Tab-separated table of C-alpha atoms in Angstrom:
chain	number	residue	atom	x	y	z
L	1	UNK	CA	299.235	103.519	99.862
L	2	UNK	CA	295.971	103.738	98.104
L	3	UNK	CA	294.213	106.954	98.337
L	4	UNK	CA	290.585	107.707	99.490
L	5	UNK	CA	288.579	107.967	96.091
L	6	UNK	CA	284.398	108.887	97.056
L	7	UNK	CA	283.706	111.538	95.228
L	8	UNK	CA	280.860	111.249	92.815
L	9	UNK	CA	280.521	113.113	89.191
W	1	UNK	CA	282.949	108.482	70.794
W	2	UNK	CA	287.062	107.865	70.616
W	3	UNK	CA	288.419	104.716	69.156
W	4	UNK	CA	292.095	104.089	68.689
W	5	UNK	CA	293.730	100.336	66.639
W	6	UNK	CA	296.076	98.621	68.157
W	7	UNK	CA	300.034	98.825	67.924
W	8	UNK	CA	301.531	95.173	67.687
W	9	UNK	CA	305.095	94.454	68.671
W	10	UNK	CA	305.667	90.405	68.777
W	11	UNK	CA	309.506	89.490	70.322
W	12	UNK	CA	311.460	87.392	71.757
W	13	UNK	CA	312.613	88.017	75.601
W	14	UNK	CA	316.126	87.177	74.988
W	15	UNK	CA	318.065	87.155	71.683
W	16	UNK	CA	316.522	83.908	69.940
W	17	UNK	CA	318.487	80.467	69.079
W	18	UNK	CA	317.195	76.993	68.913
W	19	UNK	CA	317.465	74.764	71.095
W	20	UNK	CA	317.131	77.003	73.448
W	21	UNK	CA	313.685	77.774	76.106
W	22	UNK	CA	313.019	81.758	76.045
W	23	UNK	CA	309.910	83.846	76.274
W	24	UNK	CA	307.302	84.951	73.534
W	25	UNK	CA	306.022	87.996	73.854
W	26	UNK	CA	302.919	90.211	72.349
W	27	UNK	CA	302.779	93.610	73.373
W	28	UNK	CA	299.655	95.539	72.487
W	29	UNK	CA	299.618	99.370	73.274
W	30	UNK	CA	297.899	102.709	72.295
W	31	UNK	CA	294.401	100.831	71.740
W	32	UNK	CA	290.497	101.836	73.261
W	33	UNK	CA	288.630	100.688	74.251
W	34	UNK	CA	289.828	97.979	76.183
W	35	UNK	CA	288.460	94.667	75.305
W	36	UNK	CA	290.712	93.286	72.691
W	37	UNK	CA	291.280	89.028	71.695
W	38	UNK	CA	294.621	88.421	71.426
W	39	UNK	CA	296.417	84.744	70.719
W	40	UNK	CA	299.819	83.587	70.378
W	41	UNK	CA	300.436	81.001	67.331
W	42	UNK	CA	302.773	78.162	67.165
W	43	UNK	CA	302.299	77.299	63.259
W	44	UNK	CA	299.465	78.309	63.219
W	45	UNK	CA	296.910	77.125	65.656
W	46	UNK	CA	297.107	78.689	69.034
W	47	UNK	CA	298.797	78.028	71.828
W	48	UNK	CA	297.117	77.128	74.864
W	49	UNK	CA	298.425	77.946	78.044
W	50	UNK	CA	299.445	81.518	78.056
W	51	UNK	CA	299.552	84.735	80.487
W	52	UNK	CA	299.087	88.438	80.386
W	53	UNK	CA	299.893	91.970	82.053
W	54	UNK	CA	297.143	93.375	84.515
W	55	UNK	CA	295.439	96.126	82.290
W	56	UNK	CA	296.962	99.389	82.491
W	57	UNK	CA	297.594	103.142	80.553
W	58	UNK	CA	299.160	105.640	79.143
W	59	UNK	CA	299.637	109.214	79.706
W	60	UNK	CA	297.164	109.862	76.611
W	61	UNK	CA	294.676	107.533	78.352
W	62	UNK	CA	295.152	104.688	75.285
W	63	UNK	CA	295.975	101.113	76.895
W	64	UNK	CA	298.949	98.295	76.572
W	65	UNK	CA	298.780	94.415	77.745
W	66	UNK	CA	301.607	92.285	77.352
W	67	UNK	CA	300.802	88.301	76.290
W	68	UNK	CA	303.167	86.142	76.790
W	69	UNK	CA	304.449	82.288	76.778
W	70	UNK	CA	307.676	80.261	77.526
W	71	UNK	CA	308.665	78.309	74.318
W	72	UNK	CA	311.784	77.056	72.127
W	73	UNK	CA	312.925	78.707	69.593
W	74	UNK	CA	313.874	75.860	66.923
W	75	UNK	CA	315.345	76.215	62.981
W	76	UNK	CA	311.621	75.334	61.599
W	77	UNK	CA	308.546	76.399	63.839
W	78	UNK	CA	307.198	79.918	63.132
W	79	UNK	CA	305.390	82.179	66.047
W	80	UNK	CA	303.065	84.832	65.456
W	81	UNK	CA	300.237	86.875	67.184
W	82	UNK	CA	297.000	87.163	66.038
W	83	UNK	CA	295.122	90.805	67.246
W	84	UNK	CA	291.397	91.273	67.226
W	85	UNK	CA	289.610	94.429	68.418
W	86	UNK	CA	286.769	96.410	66.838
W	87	UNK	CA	288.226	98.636	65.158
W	88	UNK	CA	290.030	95.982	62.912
W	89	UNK	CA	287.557	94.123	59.979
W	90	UNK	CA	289.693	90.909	60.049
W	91	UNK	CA	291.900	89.912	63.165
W	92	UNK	CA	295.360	90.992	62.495
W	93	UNK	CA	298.333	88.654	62.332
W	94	UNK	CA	301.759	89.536	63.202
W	95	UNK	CA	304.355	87.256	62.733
W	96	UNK	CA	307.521	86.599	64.542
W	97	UNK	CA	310.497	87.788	62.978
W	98	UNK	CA	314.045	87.456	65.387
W	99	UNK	CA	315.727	89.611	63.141
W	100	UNK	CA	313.746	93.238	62.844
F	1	UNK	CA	316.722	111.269	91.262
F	2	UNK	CA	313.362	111.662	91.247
F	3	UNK	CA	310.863	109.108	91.693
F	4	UNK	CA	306.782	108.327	91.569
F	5	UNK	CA	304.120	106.430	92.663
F	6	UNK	CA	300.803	105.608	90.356
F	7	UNK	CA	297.598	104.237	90.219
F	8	UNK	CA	295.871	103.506	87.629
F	9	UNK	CA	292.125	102.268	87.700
F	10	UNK	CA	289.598	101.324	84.565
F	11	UNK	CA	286.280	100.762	84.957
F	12	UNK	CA	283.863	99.734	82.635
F	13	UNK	CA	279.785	98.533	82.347
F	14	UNK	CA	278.487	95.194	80.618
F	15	UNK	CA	275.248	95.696	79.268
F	16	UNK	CA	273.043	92.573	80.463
F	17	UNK	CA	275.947	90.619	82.031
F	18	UNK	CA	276.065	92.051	85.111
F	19	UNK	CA	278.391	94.438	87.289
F	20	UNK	CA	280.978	96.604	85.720
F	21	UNK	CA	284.893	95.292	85.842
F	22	UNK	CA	286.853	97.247	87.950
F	23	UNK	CA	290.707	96.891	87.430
F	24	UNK	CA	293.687	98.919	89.720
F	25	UNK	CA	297.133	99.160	89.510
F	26	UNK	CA	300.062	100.413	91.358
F	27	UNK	CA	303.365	101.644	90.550
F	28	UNK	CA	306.253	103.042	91.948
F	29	UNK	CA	308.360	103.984	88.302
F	30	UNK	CA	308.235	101.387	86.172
F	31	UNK	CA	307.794	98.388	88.672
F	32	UNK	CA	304.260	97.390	89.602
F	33	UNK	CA	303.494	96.347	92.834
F	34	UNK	CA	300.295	95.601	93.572
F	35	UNK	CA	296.661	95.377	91.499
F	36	UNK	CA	292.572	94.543	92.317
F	37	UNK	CA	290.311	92.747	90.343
F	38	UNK	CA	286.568	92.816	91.166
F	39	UNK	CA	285.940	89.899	88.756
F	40	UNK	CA	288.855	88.139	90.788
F	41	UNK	CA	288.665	84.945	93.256
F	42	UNK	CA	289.924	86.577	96.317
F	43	UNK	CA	288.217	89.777	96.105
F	44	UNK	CA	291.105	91.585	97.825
F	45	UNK	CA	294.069	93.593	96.789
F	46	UNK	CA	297.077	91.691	95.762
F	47	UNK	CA	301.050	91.848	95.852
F	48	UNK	CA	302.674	91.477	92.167
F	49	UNK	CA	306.206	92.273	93.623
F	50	UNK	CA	308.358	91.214	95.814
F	51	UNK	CA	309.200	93.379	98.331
F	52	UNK	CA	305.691	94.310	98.679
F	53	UNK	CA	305.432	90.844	100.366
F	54	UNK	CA	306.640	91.982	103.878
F	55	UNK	CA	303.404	93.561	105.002
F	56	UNK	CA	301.211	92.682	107.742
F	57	UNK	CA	297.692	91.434	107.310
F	58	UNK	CA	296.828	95.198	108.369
F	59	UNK	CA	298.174	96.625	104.843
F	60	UNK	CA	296.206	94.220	102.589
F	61	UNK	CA	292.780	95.051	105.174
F	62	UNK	CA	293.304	98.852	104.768
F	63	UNK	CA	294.285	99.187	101.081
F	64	UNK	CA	291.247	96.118	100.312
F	65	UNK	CA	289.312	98.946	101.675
F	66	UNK	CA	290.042	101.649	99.972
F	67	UNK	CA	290.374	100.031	96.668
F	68	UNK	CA	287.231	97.891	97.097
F	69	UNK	CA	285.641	101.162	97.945
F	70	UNK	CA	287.070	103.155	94.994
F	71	UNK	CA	285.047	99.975	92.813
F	72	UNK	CA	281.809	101.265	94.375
F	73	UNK	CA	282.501	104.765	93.885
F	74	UNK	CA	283.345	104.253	89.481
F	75	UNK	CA	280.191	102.088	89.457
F	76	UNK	CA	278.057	104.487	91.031
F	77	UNK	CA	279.870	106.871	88.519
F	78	UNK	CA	279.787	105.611	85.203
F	79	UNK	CA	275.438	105.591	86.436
F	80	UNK	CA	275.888	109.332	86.607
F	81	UNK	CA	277.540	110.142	83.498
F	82	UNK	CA	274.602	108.071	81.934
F	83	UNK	CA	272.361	110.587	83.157
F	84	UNK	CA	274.288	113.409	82.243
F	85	UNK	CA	275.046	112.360	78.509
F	86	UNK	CA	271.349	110.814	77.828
F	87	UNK	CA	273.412	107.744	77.380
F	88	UNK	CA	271.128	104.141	76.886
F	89	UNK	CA	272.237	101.761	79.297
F	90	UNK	CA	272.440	99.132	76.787
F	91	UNK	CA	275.400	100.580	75.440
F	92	UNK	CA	279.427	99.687	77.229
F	93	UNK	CA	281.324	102.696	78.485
F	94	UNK	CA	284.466	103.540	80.453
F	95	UNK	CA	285.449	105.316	83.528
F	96	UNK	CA	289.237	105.694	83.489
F	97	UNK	CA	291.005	107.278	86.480
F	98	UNK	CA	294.710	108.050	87.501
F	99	UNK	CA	295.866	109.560	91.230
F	100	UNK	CA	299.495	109.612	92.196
F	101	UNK	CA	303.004	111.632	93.280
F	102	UNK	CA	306.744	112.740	92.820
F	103	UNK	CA	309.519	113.468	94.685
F	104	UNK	CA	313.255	114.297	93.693
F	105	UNK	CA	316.713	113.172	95.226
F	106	UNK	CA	315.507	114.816	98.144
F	107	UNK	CA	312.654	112.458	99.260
F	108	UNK	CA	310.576	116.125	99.164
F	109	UNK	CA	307.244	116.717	97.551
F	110	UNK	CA	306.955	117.683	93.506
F	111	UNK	CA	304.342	117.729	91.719
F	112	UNK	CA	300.564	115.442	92.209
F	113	UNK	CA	297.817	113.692	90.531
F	114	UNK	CA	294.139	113.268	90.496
F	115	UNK	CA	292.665	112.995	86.910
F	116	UNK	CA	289.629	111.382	85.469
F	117	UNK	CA	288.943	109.829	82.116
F	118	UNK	CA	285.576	109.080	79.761
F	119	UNK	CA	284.888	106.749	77.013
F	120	UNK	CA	289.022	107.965	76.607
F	121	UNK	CA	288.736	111.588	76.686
F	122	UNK	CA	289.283	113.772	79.686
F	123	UNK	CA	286.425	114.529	81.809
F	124	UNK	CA	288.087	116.571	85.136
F	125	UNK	CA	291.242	117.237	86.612
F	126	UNK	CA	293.346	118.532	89.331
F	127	UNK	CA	295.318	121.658	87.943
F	128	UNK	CA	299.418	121.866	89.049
F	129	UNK	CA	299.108	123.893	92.010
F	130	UNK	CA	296.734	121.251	93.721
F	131	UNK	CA	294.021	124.158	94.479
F	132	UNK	CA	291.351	124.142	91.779
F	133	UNK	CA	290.199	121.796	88.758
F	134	UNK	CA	289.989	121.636	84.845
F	135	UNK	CA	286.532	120.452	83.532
F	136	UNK	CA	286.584	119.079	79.934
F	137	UNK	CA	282.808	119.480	78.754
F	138	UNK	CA	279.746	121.081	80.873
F	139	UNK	CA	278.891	117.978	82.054
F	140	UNK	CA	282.463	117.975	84.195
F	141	UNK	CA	281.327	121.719	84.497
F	142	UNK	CA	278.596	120.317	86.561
F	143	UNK	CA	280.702	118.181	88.809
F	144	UNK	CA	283.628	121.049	89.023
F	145	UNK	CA	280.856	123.369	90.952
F	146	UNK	CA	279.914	120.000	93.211
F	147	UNK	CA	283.975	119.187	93.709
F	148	UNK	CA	284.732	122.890	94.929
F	149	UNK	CA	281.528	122.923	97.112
F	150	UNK	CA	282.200	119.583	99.138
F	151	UNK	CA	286.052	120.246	98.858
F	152	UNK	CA	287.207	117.649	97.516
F	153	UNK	CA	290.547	118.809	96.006
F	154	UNK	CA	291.748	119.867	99.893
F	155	UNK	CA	290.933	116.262	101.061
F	156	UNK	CA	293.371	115.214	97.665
F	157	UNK	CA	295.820	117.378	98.620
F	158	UNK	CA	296.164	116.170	102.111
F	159	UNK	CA	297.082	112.710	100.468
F	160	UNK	CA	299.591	113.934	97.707
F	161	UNK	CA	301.323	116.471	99.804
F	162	UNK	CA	301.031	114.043	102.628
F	163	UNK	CA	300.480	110.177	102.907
F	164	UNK	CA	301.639	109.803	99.389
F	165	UNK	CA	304.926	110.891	99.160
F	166	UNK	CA	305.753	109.306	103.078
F	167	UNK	CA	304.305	105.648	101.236
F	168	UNK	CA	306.721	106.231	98.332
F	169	UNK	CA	309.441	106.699	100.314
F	170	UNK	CA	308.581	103.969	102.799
F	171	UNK	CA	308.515	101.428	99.360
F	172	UNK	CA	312.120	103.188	98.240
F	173	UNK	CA	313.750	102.418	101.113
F	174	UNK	CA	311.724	99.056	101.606
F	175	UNK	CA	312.509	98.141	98.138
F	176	UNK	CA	316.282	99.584	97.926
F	177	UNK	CA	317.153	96.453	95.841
F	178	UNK	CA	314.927	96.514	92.995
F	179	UNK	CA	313.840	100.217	92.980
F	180	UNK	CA	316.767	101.783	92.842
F	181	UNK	CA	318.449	99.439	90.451
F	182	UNK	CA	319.510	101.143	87.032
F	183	UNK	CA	320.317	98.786	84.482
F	184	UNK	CA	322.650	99.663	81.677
F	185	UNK	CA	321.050	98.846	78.308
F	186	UNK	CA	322.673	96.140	76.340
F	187	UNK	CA	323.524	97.436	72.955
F	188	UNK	CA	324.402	96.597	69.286
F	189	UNK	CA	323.361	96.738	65.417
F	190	UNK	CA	322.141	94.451	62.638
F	191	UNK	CA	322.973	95.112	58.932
F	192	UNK	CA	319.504	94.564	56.520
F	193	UNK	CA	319.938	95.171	52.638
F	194	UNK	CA	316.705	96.797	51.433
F	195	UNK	CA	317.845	96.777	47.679
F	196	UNK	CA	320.829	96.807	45.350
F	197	UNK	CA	321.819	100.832	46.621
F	198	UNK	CA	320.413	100.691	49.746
F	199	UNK	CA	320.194	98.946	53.189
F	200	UNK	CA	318.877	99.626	57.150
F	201	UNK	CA	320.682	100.433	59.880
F	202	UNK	CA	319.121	98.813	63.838
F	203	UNK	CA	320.132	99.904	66.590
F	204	UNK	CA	319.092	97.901	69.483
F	205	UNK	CA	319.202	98.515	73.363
F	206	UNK	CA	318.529	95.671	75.592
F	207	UNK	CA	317.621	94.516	79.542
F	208	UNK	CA	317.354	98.137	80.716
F	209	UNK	CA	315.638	99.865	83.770
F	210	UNK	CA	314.109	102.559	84.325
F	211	UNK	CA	312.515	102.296	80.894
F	212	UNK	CA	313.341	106.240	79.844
F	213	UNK	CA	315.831	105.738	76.930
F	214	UNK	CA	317.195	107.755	73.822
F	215	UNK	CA	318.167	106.579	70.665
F	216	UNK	CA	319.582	109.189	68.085
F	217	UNK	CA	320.813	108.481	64.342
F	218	UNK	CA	323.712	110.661	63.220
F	219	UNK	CA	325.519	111.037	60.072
F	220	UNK	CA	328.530	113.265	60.421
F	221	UNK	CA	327.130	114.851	63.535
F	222	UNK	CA	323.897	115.621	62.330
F	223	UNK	CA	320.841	114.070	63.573
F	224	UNK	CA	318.478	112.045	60.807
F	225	UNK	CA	316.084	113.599	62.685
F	226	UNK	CA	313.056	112.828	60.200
F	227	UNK	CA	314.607	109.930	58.245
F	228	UNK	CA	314.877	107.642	61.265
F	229	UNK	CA	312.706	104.740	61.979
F	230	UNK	CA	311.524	103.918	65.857
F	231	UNK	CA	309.479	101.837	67.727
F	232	UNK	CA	307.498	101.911	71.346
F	233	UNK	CA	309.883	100.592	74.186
F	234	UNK	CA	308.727	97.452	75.168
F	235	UNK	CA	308.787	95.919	78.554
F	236	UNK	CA	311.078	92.302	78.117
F	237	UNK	CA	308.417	91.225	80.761
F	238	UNK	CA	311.152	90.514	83.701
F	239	UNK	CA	311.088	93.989	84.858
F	240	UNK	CA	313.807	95.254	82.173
F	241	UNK	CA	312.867	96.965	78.925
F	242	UNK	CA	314.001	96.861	74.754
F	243	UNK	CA	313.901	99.075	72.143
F	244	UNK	CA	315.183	99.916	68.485
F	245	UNK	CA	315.986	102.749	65.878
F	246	UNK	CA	316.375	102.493	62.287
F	247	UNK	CA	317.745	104.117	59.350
F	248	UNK	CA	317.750	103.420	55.468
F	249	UNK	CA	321.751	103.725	54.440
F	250	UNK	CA	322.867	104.645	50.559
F	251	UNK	CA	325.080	100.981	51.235
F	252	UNK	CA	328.840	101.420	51.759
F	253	UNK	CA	328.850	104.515	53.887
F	254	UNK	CA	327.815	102.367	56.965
F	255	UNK	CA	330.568	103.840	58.690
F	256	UNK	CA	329.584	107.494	58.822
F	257	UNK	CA	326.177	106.921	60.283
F	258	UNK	CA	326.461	106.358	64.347
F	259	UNK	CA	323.994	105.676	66.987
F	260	UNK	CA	323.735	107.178	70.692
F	261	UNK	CA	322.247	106.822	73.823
F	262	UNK	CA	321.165	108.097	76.430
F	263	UNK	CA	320.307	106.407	79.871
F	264	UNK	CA	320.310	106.497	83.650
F	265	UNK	CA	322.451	103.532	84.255
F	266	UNK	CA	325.300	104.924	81.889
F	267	UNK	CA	327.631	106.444	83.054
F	268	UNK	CA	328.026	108.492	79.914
F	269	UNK	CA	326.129	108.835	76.332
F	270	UNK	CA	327.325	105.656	73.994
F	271	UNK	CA	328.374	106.144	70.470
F	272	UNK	CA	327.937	102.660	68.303
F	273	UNK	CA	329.415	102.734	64.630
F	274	UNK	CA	328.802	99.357	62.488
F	275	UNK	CA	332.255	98.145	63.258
F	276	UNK	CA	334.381	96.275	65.305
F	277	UNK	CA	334.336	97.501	69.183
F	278	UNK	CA	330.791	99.536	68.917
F	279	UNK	CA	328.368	97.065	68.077
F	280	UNK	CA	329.238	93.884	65.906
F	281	UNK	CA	333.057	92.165	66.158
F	282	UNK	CA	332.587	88.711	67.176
F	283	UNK	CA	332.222	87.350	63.892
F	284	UNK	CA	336.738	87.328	63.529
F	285	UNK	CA	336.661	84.212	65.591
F	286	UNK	CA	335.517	79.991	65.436
């Protein structure tokens, strides 16, 4: 199970 | 910025001997970036036909790809692997040796 | 034992030829199971084992989604860092990331991942105790203060702790057969004369799974531990792995070196001499 990556630099 | 060479390891799948279909493989590791040309040789000009590893990475962050083809093994034809990335001047040939 | 899910994403730009290539993979050990390619026909995630096959349409829609979405994220990313480094836009660049679990013979939580990687050197990370982050250069320094402020390591945890660990045990127990398989390695030794006083010594171990291995070189009990050649382990490319160790012997005292290993699948450490029952005795036959 992919994760939930939205994070921005 | 960080640049790292290739490592080349070219092998057979299964212990070698002619007459015999098997697997040639090209493993690539501990390079960056990530583009990198890479073609097997059957005496050599390259073989056509031939498949590799989704791209993936190390614990240091450095990447690995494994090329590979099916092929037979026979007492006369030499295999090798031919390596080009930019950190190299000249692409690199490996050749394939069953032995070490 | 323990075991643990990864993913593994690269991103990276191409100056005047359009959008960057995004490129994730998943494992559970050393098996992959599933990747995404933006560059790729179908556009959605994909199975690359087998017993990730029996899934309903409603596992490829969610985890399209969330990878898919993790593409527009690194793009939007890699735009950022451009900024921050007073980087030209003509030039290629990477965005490397890594998330992931463990667990132990338990099934129970160990230890998590969240990391980020640029142009191959660590930009931020997720410290051990899943609570606060590690910021390479200012620029990450930036992005640290932004991370605490919108929380972002709580919403990771959630998934590590969580979801993660209850989607590696679903694909342990879904994938009994090949995931818990431990393959014995396949051993033996070749004899190479390097000159008229000398000669090597390989060790080889063959068809073995999980890929974490150890070959030692031992003369008399003690370990050539700085006179012994070794290489990567390799993957076979069936799922199994190789690998080799080498020594340089003063020829005719072949028999006091010995080679050992270590692995999962035996039952006990080996101990190969070059002799007859050990490595190399089926040349007394036709």
């Amino acid at each position: 199970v992919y994760g939930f990556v939205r994070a921005c630099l | 910025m960080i640049q790292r060479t290739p490592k080349i390891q070219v092998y057979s799948r299964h212990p070698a001997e002619n007459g015999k279909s098997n697997f040639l493989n090209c493993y690539v590791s501990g390079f960056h970036p990530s583009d990198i040309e890479v073609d097997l040789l059957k005496n050599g000009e390259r073989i056509e036909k031939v498949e590799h590893s989704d791209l993936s990475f190390s614990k240091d962050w450095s990447f690995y790809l494994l090329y590979y083809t099916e092929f037979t093994p026979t007492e006369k034809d030499e295999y090798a692997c031919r390596v080009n990335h930019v950190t190299l001047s000249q692409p690199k040939i490996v050749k394939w040796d069953r032995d070490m | 034992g323990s075991h643990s899910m990864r993913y593994f994403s690269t991103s990276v730009s191409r100056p005047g030829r359009g959008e960057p290539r995004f490129i994730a993979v998943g494992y559970v050990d050393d098996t992959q199971f599933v990747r995404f390619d933006s560059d790729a026909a179908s556009q959605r995630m994909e199975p690359r084992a087998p017993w990730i096959e029996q899934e309903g349409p409603e596992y490829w829609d969610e985890e399209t989604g969330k990878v898919k979405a993790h593409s527009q994220t690194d793009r939007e990313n890699l735009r950022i860092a451009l900024r921050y480094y007073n980087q030209s836009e003509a030039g290629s660049h990477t965005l490397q990331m890594m998330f992931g679990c463990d667990v132990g013979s338990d099934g129970r939580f160990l230890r998590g991942y969240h990391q980020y990687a640029y142009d191959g050197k660590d930009y931020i990370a997720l410290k051990e105790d899943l609570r606060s982050w590690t910021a390479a250069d200012m620029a990450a320094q930036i992005t640290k203060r932004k991370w605490e402020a919108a929380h972002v390591a709580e919403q990771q945890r959630a998934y590590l702790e969580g979801t993660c660990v209850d989607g590696l045990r679903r694909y342990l127990e879904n994938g009994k057969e090949t995931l818990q398989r431990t393959d014995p390695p396949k051993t033996h030794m070749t004899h190479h004369p390097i000159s008229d006083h000398e000669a090597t010594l390989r060790c080889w171990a063959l068809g073995f799974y999980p890929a974490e291995i150890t070959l030692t070189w031992q003369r008399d009990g003690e370990d050539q531990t700085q006179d012994t050649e070794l290489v990567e382990t390799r993957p076979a490319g069936d799922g199994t792995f190789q690998k080799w160790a080498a020594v340089v012997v003063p020829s005719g005292e072949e028999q006091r070196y010995t080679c050992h290993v270590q692995h999962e699948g035996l039952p006990k450490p080996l101990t190969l001499r070059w002799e007859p029952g050990s490595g190399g005795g089926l040349n007394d036959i036709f």
